[PDB]
Amino acid sequence: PRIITKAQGVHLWDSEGHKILDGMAGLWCVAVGYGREELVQAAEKQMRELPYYNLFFQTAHPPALELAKAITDVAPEGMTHVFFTGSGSEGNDTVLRMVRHYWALKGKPHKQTIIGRINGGIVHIPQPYWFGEGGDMTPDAFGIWAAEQLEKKILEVGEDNVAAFIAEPIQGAGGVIIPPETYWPKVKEILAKYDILFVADEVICGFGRTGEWFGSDYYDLKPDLMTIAKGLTSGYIPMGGVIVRDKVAKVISEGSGHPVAAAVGLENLRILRDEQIVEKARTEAAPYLQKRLRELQDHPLVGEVRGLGMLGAIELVKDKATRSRYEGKGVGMICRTFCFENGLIMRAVGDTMIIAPPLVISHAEIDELVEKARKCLDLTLEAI
Amino acid sequence: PRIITKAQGVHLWDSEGHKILDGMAGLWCVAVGYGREELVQAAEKQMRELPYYNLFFQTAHPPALELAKAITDVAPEGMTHVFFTGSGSEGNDTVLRMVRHYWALKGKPHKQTIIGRINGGIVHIPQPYWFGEGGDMTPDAFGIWAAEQLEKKILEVGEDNVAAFIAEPIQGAGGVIIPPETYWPKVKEILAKYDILFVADEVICGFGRTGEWFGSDYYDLKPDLMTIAKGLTSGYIPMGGVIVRDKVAKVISESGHPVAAAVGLENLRILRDEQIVEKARTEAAPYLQKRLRELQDHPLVGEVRGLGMLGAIELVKDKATRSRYEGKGVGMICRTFCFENGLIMRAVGDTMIIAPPLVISHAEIDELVEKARKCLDLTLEAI
């Protein structure tokens, strides 16, 4: 366990003066990067004024109402309400209660089952991970097939027994599973046929991570509920939320947020907008990040490099043609260790190395990342 | 009323300069009172060095670890572990899954049912509310009966099918339901007979509210799990948690946001180093309970009850029968007068309730009860 004494921009400094590039932005959290005093001052001002309370007695410009309006401004069309929580985990619980409450109010209490994906009361369908699970199929065909497994499960369970499909636009913690380009159009086509709610888990994809405001923007999804956290405050203060489409909010309405967290969240969103951090990540940072990341495709250890927006993944293989793994050898952990010893935070999911840098990472910092990553891929192979 | 421009000690100031005594401590949470700059500085400091992280990389003295130890320091017995959450509600969600997981890992997956109380997979037993439900029984005899309904319900569901009993030591949001003195002794007798977990809901009672550190302390309860929030940070930043007994944690074994934890750590340090819990018990609570009970002569008041830093006033139409102005919205009338006259009291039905900041002074207690009596006058005159 290394002791950090400073954090600024994309870098940590440990107690030994070693400078570390944080390629995971905290835990997918620190969108604007470390050391933005403005977020400190927003928490300090709100805590010093009136630390807590709402309705009957409130401050002049309550940050939560302004936060919700600002969230709905950058959210997909029709997403008009926001219910705030203390965390992303509390958000995903809140959302699953909302879908079942929604159907109960609609007079359909049998609509109880949540369909989710492997590695993403509850039933599961295959995740759209071509690299590990697609075999010799084309990405396009494996994406259509995986999406088709949602329809099968809806009919197997029974539409009148299904409440909702829940999914991250891109599975984060499961290994930056970027689906084939056929996947989401096919899922939309299936969702169009069935009276079930679609929950977009945007706790990782939300607030700039794909180059759009939300992963739902990236894939033109029209979810009914979106769970958010993390990037919402750039991780400076805990907070989650559920964004709700107008029709759903209308049903739930007939049958909130802490001010200090909301003040951090409002200021974090304002910075992302007024400094065009999201837009510049899409147009300037991500093109450089993805081109330079894939330059590692030549490495003997790298079976694949994938990524879009500010997400990236590097697969560690034993043979490239067959996409096999150094089974049992804990290659991911070994690579991660060398990463930590050479001032680079990547995380390992299996033998997948994943990165999600702060959105403000510069080209020069991207050069530092891919340089340190190749450096540790050599160290890993040599160690094997 | 409406726009608040300054909050200090036990008072809020609106934009026209009216000083309002917050008799509810935010919503049961502002234990140390408003305007404590130490908590601001703790959050500010922790936010600017490193905002967030877990293992592999950590700050020099991670606040969550110290806070766990500080909490267990003041917690009962062998409450050894703390698991942090973002809120009290998340804490209560976590504790219900913790008890069910505990019995799964022990190979008893049928132990699923949670026993709660009315006004507190789920089954309910009567709340120990003598004023509203005891009729003509003595409080002592009503309290025994209410507790005995816990045994009946365990046996009715079947011990093998019950995971846990969950209760606040004193129901807060339900209207400060202070039980008869015989209730918790009889409940402990019952719990001692059956192999179920006991969850004390301490979101409201924790961190000094009863004059002890916890409601479990006041009634010498030995819960297996305790849910906490609110006073833990004095509401300056949201946080919740679950304190776990050693035997539960050992089975469950087989992290909290650093800024929230840094605020909770300094808030706990203040409650201890300035003896705020102790002085509430020995100085503020007796004065408060005394002056509150002087309202019992008011024609509208059917009962004053209270212990520690909790208080309740029952508004009745007829004292002897304990009857209510049915349908006439009396509690809401009274609360509106309170707000207009610089006093925040919550209404639950026709009970007015208070839970002031623990630091409230005798002068401020005088202020509260002068204002309460004025509004009891205004309420009865409007009726």
Residue numbers in the entry:
A (entry chain A): 34 to 153, 180 to 314, 324 to 452
B (entry chain B): 34 to 153, 180 to 313, 324 to 452
Published text:
We earlier identified a putrescine transaminase spuC gene in Pseudomonas putida with preference to aliphatic diamines other than putrescine such as cadaverine and spermidine. A basic local alignment search tool (BLAST) analysis revealed a 76% protein sequence identity to a spuC gene from Pseudomonas aeruginosa, that was previously characterized to be part of a polyamine uptake and utilization pathway converting putrescine to 4-aminobutyraldehyde. In this study, we report on the detailed characterization (structural and biochemical) of the putrescine transaminase Pp-SpuC, and its application in the transamination of a comprehensive range of ketones/aldehydes for the production of a variety of benzylamine derivatives. We recognized the important dual substrate recognition of Pp-SpuC, accepting cadaverine or isopropylamine as the equilibrium shifting amine donor, and having excellent activity against a broad range of aromatic aldehyde derivatives bearing various electron-donating and electron-withdrawing substituents, as well as different heteroatoms in the ring, with excellent conversions.
